[PDB]
């Protein structure tokens, strides 16, 4: 299942989430997984994880191995398909009012030129991003500066609504329909291939350098 934890740090700018159940440590050995500064939310840090929903887990927020940790709290994840938590004085599953759902999708363009488009449909009316309110081929998207051959598109919504999109070059090359499941306020996906050969990754693939 897709886990997301946001923490308004009270332990400094270097923090991690340690998760455990019966000696299972899905976020890694102590101190766990480092939480990255949350985009668009000063003071917050965020980590994502895939874990086995066969069980609940315990969470220990800490300063990433530098001697300080908060008291354990239970993540009642058993049987759930997804879960996003906010920790700001206490554990919450309620999105803060000012937060949006920001979905980032990376596409690896190979031998289809340097002008790439993203066509999008099915999102909430509040949606903003390259392809909103645009008929085929959609909106043109820029290249990822740090990753060669990749292009990025970001769709922001006020509500947690799934949608679909297609990457293309407006010249006969396009992906399969990409069905985007929004599982958190900072959902990230990686896409490769074209029609018949489109693959969607929920964690960065080896192709992501
Ligand atoms: O899952 C089965 C076990 O569950 C329980 O163990 C838990 C602990 O209760 C938690 O506290 C935690 O342990 C952490 C610990 O909190 C953390 O500080 C770190 O411990 C280091 C410590 O920093 C360092 O100073 C030195 O003392 O070594 C310690 C190593 O023990 O890391 C610990 C985890 O590796 O999580 C565990 C589960 O992983 C329960 O208490 C057990 O009885 C049970 O078997
Ligand atoms: O929601 C209504 C509509 O949704 C689906 O249609 C989508 C297509 O499945 C999808 O491929 C895409 O179509 C584009 C073509 O791929 C592209 O080649 C070019 O011709 O532009 C098309 C978009 O105008 O998007 C549409 C939705 O706009 C679903 O399959 C339909 O059954 C359904 O009617």
Cα separation, 77 vs 79, whole angstroms:
6
Token pair listed for 67? 């001697």
Strands 2-8 and 73-75, by their bridges, are unpaired
Distance CA 53, CA 110 (A): 36
Expressed in angstroms and rounded, the spacing between residue 117 Cα and the centre of ligand 2 is 15
Token reading at 33: 């997984």
Burial class from Cβ neighbours inside 10 Å (0-12, 13-18, 19+) for residue 142 reads exposed
Resolution, in Å, please? 2.0
Indicate the pairing of strand 188-192 with strand 199-201: antiparallel
Alpha helices in the chain (DSSP H): none
Phi, psi of 49 (to 5 degrees): -160, 145
The dihedrals phi and psi of 84, each to the nearest 5 degrees, come to: -120, 130
Method used to solve the structure: X-ray
User: What spacing in Å lies between the alpha carbon of 61 and ligand 2's midpoint?
Assistant: 44
Q: 94 - beta bridge partners? A: none
Q: Which two tokens stand for residue 153?
A: 């598109």
Cβ of 71 closer than 6 Å to ligand 1, yes or no, is no
Residue 101 CA neighbour count, 13 Å, CB half: 19
Contact 133, 95 (CB under 8 A): no
- Of residues 145, 150, 142, 141, the one with CA closest to residue 208: 150
Radius of gyration of the chain (CA): 19
Regarding the beta carbon of 171 and ligand 2, being less than 6 Å apart is answered no
Ligand 1 pocket mutation, candidates 11, 16, 17, 20, criterion most atoms within 8 A of CB: 20
Distance 139 CA to ligand 2 centre (A): 15
Q: From the CB of 166, is ligand 2 less than 6 Å away?
A: yes
CA of 30 to the centre of ligand 1 (A): 8
Beta carbons of 117 and 134 less than 8 angstroms apart: no
- Say whether 73 sits in a helix, a strand or coil: strand
Chain centroid to CA 170: 27
Tell me how far the alpha carbon of residue 187 is from its chain's centroid. 3
Q: Give the separation between CA 48 and CA 42, rounded to whole angstroms.
A: 18
User: Which of 170, 177, 196, 198 has most ligand 2 atoms within 8 Å of CB, for mutation?
Assistant: 177
């Amino acid at each position: 299942m897709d886990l997301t934890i946001n923490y308004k740090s009270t332990l400094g700018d270097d923090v991690a989430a340690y998760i455990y159940k019966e000696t299972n440590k899905p976020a890694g050995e102590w101190p766990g997984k480092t939480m990255t500064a949350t985009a668009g939310h000063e003071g917050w840090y965020t980590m994502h994880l895939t874990l086995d929903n066969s069980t609940d887990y315990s969470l220990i927020l800490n300063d990433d191995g530098h001697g300080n940790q908060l008291k354990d709290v239970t993540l009642s994840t058993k049987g759930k398909a997804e879960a996003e938590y906010w920790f700001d004085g206490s554990l919450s599953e309620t999105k803060p009012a000012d937060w949006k759902y920001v979905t980032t999708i990376h596409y690896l363009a190979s031998g289809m030129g340097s002008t790439i488009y993203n066509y999008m449909w099915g999102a909430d009316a509040s949606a903003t991003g390259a392809g909103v309110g645009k008929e085929w081929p959609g909106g043109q998207i820029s290249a990822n500066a740090d990753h060669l051959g990749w292009y990025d598109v970001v769709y922001t919504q006020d509500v947690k609504q799934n949608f679909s999109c297609i990457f293309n070059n407006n010249n006969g090359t396009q992906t399969d329909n990409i069905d985007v499941s929004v599982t958190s306020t900072s959902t990230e996906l990686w896409v490769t291939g074209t029609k018949g050969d489109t693959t969607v990754y929920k964690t960065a693939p080896d192709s992501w350098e």
